Curated annotation (Swiss-Prot):
SMART domains in alphabetical order: PROF
Protein source organism: Arabidopsis thaliana (Mouse-ear cress)
Protein name per its UniProtKB record: Profilin-2
TM ranges: none
Main localisation: cytoplasm
Species classification: Eukaryota, Viridiplantae, Streptophyta, Embryophyta, Tracheophyta
Family under the similarity heading: Belongs to the profilin family.
Amino acid sequence: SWQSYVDDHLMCEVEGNHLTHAAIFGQDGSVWAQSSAFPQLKPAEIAGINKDFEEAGHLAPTGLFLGGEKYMVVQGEAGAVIRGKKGPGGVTIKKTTQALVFGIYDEPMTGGQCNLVVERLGDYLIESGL
């Protein structure tokens, strides 16, 4: 179940903290499963997401946009991870073979605890073909 992947493995608490929002998108833009309040993502936002996984740095100018709200781009894993920052929160976008794993965190959480749950689940999905 894609929903339990969101709830039990992207929204799991680590030291009392959990991601604000989490979602698993198919690379075709379609939501596979998301947290209740995950923002809706404009189709251009997912294109800019996808082209940045091709050759990084496409999103670094202009920044990374998700649901209209902008995140300033920060260092990632080229072709595997996109990371962004907005004040005391940010986002991790881990690309699997078929999907896009999203984690959005706020001020109690760290970028580190975000990359933990996001890139974890992602790396596991790649190993099972997803």
